[PDB]
Design a protein around this ligand. Structure first.
Ligand SMILES: Nc1ncnc2c1ncn2[C@@H]1O[C@H](COP(=O)(O)OP(=O)(O)O)[C@@H](O)[C@H]1O
Ligand SMILES: Nc1ncnc2c1ncn2[C@@H]1O[C@H](COP(=O)(O)OP(=O)(O)O)[C@@H](O)[C@H]1O
Lengths: 472, 497, 472, 497
């Protein structure tokens, strides 16, 4: 059923083309258009793939795959899978059975992962320059309005807190990072807080050693019931009370005499940080479900009130306030910062880093070409094709910078004949090849490995499927 | 013409599952109309869940579903074959041969093949595991089923096979055909998270608990077990006897004549010491779902109150032992009362390897069951099909008329399995078949196709490629029935509900 | 270039379809239509292929091949080639390279010729019943109006004369047989003459020991020249004078005081029989170029004058007068008689004969199926296909008789499992299989061999050619 | 775009001759527009006689015609290659690589290959036929050319080869390259009807006559030959001396000092007896066309009249002998004056076998000439192409820029010859090539493809598959020139005659 396969390959190629030009540290932006008419301008690939109007099953699948295990790297996986698909197509026209191409690609994947594992430069949490570089790596091309060397600082400072070593590996519980945003000034007004932050005259403000009530949950009778509900909570010794559902202002008065938030993604991290737990029904509420916060308080953002939970019990607590002008700015800042956090977190947790600019890529290709003749006939071609498909990334990376792809590919290929140039990659601003390690173009080995892995998996899935059937 | 349309319908359906055959069977993606998807190269899943269009195709689906119902292994093999039969029939229709003739020819061919299946079958030795003959067979078939689906290391696999063997020892047997009826209800697979696969272990039940008190007896030769629910107006008040109470409870338990006490709610140190003095094996608290399972086998009864207890509630087991399992001590119970199923502790280092091991054991068990039910093996890799084809041509020669061509056309269909099965391995669909014919007609009937290795094998038994007869005959049957039923239908008629 | 090959195969299949139904001893007739409007109804295949409106190059080629070395047998060759082409097509769809199919067919051809050589029953000129049978064989289905056992007599009598043994083999110089025709009565009025026959008060009639002048070739001046020309001939001692060009009646008067024929095909055989030779220019005429005819004369056909050259020197001289009603009758008689003469001549010259009814065919197939597995894989299929293509002839032969092909094929196949039924073929009138030898269904082995040979050659030529090109 | 059209034109042309390559080269049918046809798998014939359509294709035809002009053997091989180069170029155009770059790359690759041809060439020994080294080589190459085109029995063939060898002994030599220049003008092939092929024989001239009179001398060691035109108012009348005349004529002939007399008009018994007395070798009458040929070599002159004759008209030959040739006595003349060509008496039992033998000898001679002109052999069956491809990739590595891809694309084209050449033998165009690469990169450069046998050979020299260097280099040259010239043309422009 070639007719069903070609459509899959076309879908993959379509998504590649969708995310292609976004790639690199000079990646152009895409303009997403909602059917409403509203729009979203962005560089980040994950966001695109999220808001993107997915058509094909294989497409939605591919997206589902590229996002699996770390926000970034998706870009790489997608484009790589696209290249592999195209080269697979080229191989298919030569009447080569898919089960051969798959096997070849698998071998190539193994050799690739060996290659990355071999090249990788071990790093530690102490090598902060590396962390900074890795942070700054993804931050390039984000169109963030400056403060890259400051946002990177915030990242490096952020990951440092959320880290504790039980044994050999620090348990960087990334999920403890709260992220909010507001307008005004610029991203220089961005700032960290140790505790979680959340965007009537009410209850008191500065609570020291605060117990925090975390709760997701004829008229006269209802009043009695509601007051009963409030008193129940009051009888547990709760300093500050948090909710998600709408609270009757009468209960606000009551409690004031004793916020409703909006999102549970905050209440989550609040429960994480404070040490308390959420309750579905206040009838079950106790005094141990209350979270401990050593110095809770509230502060004014230039245009708005904002809640601060400082002095949270848990050591691994952290939040960041984002600031800027337009929505696109603060959003791109958010997503970029997420990417940074991801990359750095993976660097820390894994403890290995490599050079960008496509050094690892041309190295992997270089290796594959050597290993290719050592196996059978038809597989060798698949492996070679795999290598080429990898080089495609360098080429596209060159394209997105306004450079001639082939020339730079050949240059790097020529340079990587020396053992001592295994870090050399493409300086896109300069235009010439350079040692990407000194320029702080560093990325987590785990990201590269995962990208390769997921792309391979995706393409093999594309090739393994012979036909598409409607079921029930 | 309508017949030809039906034929095309069934044929076109069969064309899809042509690629999903054997080890290298390509995937098929099922779109659950609810907005969900599931992909597989499994005949049953595909044929089942898929919403078929044409009636003839639906009938073929029906045949396949029956084929699956009778036995699990072969389903696609039947559909591909049916398609082949119809495809070979439509060539005889062009020879202007009436369908009924083809049908009878196919019937005769089927009967002869069915007769020839055992003639070409290699019967096995099932006379005990003392001898290890059965083990070698079980090892071959194990690897037959396991090889296609495992990427795990062989050393890890060998242990799993060892377990399955150890399982089969215990499982029942029907006498009439000198075979064994593996009741899969007599096998448990407890998926324990944490630990390597080699740490996995087989035993007739175990609670996965450590000895409550080291002084406590960690091994009991002749055991006696008790199940305890409660941990050790008209007003009722407890008499002021705190420790004496506990001691008396333990003495009552000792008085009943028990050597093991598996409390539901857990045991306190004082009770532990008393039990340790009496030399009783104490066990920590266990889940209700666990204890409920235990009592019925153990022939015991969950005692609500020891004061009212009685030896009627006393269970028993042949042996109990605190055994080390991957540096994790566990209480093992052996051969107690109604042994029922053999319990596997499956130590998976990850949910993937866990479910993978479980899956492997399941498939292996099912296949071994299928071969054990009918103790005759057939040379897989398409060898037996070719052999049958040769024999059926030889048999076709001795029949005359248009039926000589109908039988010969039955043979040409069988040979599509070797053809397709090799093609999946990327081998040339033609040269492979003629090479096979050459090797076959001039050599052993065991000449076949190793799809995994992607090569033609002179003897597939040596490569541990084995197929049960119970499956094959049924596949043949349902396939023949299907192709027949398709060919027998003249045309369509508009009806009223 | 499959696109060019398929067209060739289609052409061959077209010509097969053209000559298909004419096959056998119950072969239907085809109606040929000239663009003028005139028509020609006939069974004979050669005649069809001659007058047929040929379209394709490969077609004209195939016709050119089937007619090469014996008028009949062309039928067989054509149809066989058609079957082989169809089966080749069937083999081609299985992605088998032509050079394999060719080789297979060649092997099959060799085995076939071995088979015919093996089966063949040696015969001699003395076994006249065989000659009669072979004559009658082709004569069946000719729609000739009776006298088959008499025309066959004339044939047997005819070939007997034209035969002389230098060594091991009689030199049957078939070209010495003159053939003319006239209307009136029926074919019972057909009759032989030892000498050649050719259709003013003039020169004398009954010339004993006749010398025959064979010659293919202001007004007063021309008269002088012509008279000079006549006198030149007169001065050589020529009894009877023959010409081709138009003769001035003045020269007829002259010569009368001392015919212009129409065709040189007669003058040829006249030169053959009389022992004299033709002269292009009478200036070169001598007395030795005159042919010796012991008793020349003329006779009256019921409606016309006719010339008889009886007592010709050469022993191997013979002519036949054909008689009948309509043109189709006398024509079909002519062509049929040619076929008979051919077959019988080949039987005599070769000295081997086999049974018709497709016995030899099912024997050859039977052999090929046995020999097929003894060679390689892909060739085996070609050989098997060859066998089937041969059986196709039996099937078509059954079709043309209003019988069920497959049943009779299976019957004969079943019968030919016995060594003692190697002659059994299909009795078309009876409808059942019977020993074709006793029924006088006998044919020359050489004809069968040649048919096989030419068909094989044709099909291989069709398969060898990849594309068709226009040259200059 | 116009470039791409040209490329497609040349490519589409090359596609046709793709199948006509090598031994199993499929046929092409040429329709002579006059209402005639000629079919062949020959490049030269096809390319020549065919009326080509597109200009680019016409240019490719031009290149091919040049390729044929320089040397006869390889013509199609050039066209297929050119097509391959363009096809590999159009893939680089899609890489957005300007044509001129590709052109330079191809030029460099060509130069390097041209340099590598001799490096990978196996030079031979041509130092005399005394040694038989040359014979073994000549035998191998003989069989190389002969094997593809002969269906005749080997024993018959061996004699033909023996003849060709015996011919080559006599033929001239150029010194500079230590090679031999076989002037085909120094070979006659007289097609005698009647007799077996083994009866065929070689000699420096022979008249195919029997000894007129058995008493006459049938063998003369030191010979002297004469050519006689006439058989032995102012009024002139012959003197009444009948036999005395004849005797005196013969005595005059004997007086001149001749030992052989080949009369144009034939000799009478009296003259025969006189000649027999004098011990002169008499020969019957011969054709004018024959005698005219004889006299110029023999340095003699056709004597109109013996009375006026003179030793100036006397010829000479080293040896003359009445030899038996298939039970047919014939007068052989050896080593006379200007030996010029060696004369073959070709005894064909049939015109077919006759023309076949002639054809065989011709082809063998041409090929042997081509290899002898440049005494270095190359491993045929596509081996040398693969070797070059390996070396050219290795060489391409040490070049940078877009040219590294242009050279690599030159290599990928060469490998189309092994691919196509095997494909003609019905082998898989892909697996064969990778198998070759494997055998080649890891083994001898002589690994190639036996098309006749239809199999991949580890060493093609052992299978007597040999290719001259003189042809190969020229093919490479003209192919490169062609593909270049096609790639170099930007677009088309309307012009005025
Ligand atoms: N400063 C830089 N110089 C050269 N290459 C870079 C640089 N920064 C990133 N890259 C390259 O960009 C690729 C990742 O790009 P992309 O995924 O689009 O952005 P992000 O890294 O933010 O996810 C990597 O392959 C890496 O080699
Ligand atoms: N009397 C007969 N009975 C059976 N078959 C016959 C008879 N006469 C001829 N045939 C068959 O007919 C075929 C030749 O038919 P065809 O070429 O059409 O006529 P002709 O023999 O006049 O050329 C042969 O294969 C032969 O077997």
């Amino acid at each position: 059923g070639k007719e069903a396969l070609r459509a899959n390959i076309a879908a993959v190629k379509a998504i590649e083309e969708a995310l292609k030009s976004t790639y690199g540290p000079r990646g152009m932006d895409k303009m997403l258009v909602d059917s409403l008419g509203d729009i979203t301008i962005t560089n980040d690939g994950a966001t695109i793939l999220d808001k993107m109007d997915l058509q094909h099953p294989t497409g939605k699948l591919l997206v589902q795959i590229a996002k699996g295990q770390t926000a970034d790297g998706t870009k790489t996986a997608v484009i790589l899978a696209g290249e592999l698909a195209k080269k697979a197509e080229d191989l298919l026209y030569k009447e080569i059975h898919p089960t051969i191409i798959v096997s070849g690609y698998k071998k190539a994947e193994e050799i690739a992962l060996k290659t990355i594992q071999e090249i990788a430069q071990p790093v530690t949490i102490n090598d902060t320059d590396v962390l900074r570089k890795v942070a700054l790596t993804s931050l390039g091309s984000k169109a963030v309005a400056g403060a890259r060397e400051y946002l990177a600082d915030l990242v490096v400072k952020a990951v440092a807190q959320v880290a504790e070593l039980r044994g050999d590996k620090w348990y960087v519980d990334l999920d403890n990072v709260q992220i909010v945003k507001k307008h005004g000034g610029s991203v220089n007004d961005t700032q960290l807080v140790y505790g979680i932050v959340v965007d009537h005259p009410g209850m008191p403000k500065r609570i020291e050693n605060a117990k925090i009530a975390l709760l997701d949950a004829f008229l006269e009778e209802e009043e009695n019931i509601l007051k009963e509900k409030v008193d129940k909570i009051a009888a547990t010794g709760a300093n500050v009370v948090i909710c998600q559902k709408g609270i009757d202002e009468v209960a606000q008065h009551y409690l004031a005499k004793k916020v409703r938030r909006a999102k549970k993604s905050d209440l989550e991290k609040l429960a994480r940080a404070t040490g308390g737990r959420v309750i579905s029904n206040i009838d079950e509420l106790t005094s141990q479900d209350l979270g401990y916060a050593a110095l809770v308080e509230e502060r004014k953002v230039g245009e708005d009130k904002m809640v601060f939970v400082e002095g949270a019990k848990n050591p691994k607590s952290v939040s960041i306030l984002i600031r800027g002008g337009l929505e696109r700015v603060v959003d791109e800042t958010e997503r970029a910062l997420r990417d940074a956090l991801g990359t750095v977190a993976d660097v820390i947790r894994d403890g290995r880093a490599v050079a960008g600019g496509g050094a690892v890529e041309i190295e992997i290709a270089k290796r594959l070409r050597k290993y290719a003749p050592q196996v059978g006939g038809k597989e060798q071609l698949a492996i070679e094709a795999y290598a080429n498909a990898i080089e495609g990334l360098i080429m596209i990376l060159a394209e997105n910078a306004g450079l001639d792809p082939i020339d730079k590919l050949m240059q790097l290929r020529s340079l990587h004949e020396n053992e001592t140039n295994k870090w050399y990659g493409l300086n896109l601003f300069t235009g010439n090849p350079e040692d990407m390690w000194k320029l702080g173009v560093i990325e987590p080995a785990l990201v590269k490995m995962n990208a390769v892995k997921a792309a391979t998996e995706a393409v093999t899935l594309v090739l393994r499927i012979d036909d598409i059937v409607a079921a029930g | 013409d309508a017949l030809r349309n039906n034929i095309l319908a069934a044929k076109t359906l069969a064309e899809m599952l042509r690629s999903s055959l054997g080890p290298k069977g390509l995937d098929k993606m099922l779109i659950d109309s609810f907005g969900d998807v599931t992909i597989t190269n499994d005949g049953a899943t595909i044929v089942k869940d898929m919403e078929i269009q044409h009636p003839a195709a639906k009938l073929l689906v029906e045949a396949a579903k029956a084929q699956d119902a009778e036995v699990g292994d072969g389903t696609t093999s039947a559909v591909v074959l049916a398609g082949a039969l119809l495809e070979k029939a439509e060539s005889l229709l062009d020879q202007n041969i009436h369908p009924t003739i083809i049908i009878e020819g196919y019937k005769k061919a089927y009967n002869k093949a069915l007769e020839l299946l055992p003639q070409l079958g290699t019967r096995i030795d099932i006379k005990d595991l003392n001898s290890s003959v059965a083990r070698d067979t079980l090892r071959k078939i194990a690897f037959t089923t396991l090889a296609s689906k495992f990427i795990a290391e062989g050393a890890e696999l060998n242990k799993i096979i060892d377990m399955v063997i150890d399982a089969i020892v215990n499982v029942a047997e029907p006498l009439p055909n000198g075979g064994y009826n593996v009741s899969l209800d007599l096998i448990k697979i407890d998926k324990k998270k944490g630990g390597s696969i080699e740490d996995s272990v087989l035993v007739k039940g175990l609670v996965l608990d450590k000895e409550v008190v080291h002084p406590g007896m960690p091994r009991r030769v002749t055991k006696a077990k008790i199940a305890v629910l409660d941990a050790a107006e008209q007003i009722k008040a407890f008499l002021d006897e705190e420790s004496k109470y506990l001691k008396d409870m333990v003495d009552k338990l000792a008085s009943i004549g028990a050597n093991v006490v598996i409390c539901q709610k857990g045991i306190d140190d004082i009770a532990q010491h008393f039990l340790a003095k009496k030399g009783i094996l104490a066990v920590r608290r266990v889940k209700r779902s666990d204890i409920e399972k235990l009592e019925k086998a153990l022939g015991a009864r969950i005692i609500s109150s020891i004061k009212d207890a009685t030896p009627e509630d006393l269970g028993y087991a042949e042996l109990v032992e605190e055994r080390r399992v991957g540096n994790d001590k566990m209480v093992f119970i052996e051969g107690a009362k109604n042994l029922k199923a053999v319990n596997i502790l499956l130590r998976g280092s990850n949910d993937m390897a866990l479910d993978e091991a479980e899956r492997s054991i399941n498939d292996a068990l099912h296949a071994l069951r299928n071969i054990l039910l009918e103790p005759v093996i057939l040379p897989g890799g398409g060898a037996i099909e070719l052999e049958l084809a040769m024999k059926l041509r030889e048999y076709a020669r001795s029949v005359g008329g248009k039926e000589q061509l109908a039988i010969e056309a039955f043979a040409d269909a069988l040979e599509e399995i070797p053809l397709i099965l090799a093609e999946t391995a990327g081998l040339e669909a033609i040269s492979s078949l003629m090479d096979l014919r050459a090797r076959h007609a001039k050599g052993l009937s065991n000449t076949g196709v190793d799809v995994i290795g992607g090569k033609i094998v002179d003897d597939v038994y040596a490569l541990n490629i084995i197929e049960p007869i119970r499956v094959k005959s049924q596949v043949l049957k349902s396939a023949t029935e299907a192709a027949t039923a398709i060919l027998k239908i003249d045309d369509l008629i508009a009806a009223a509900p």
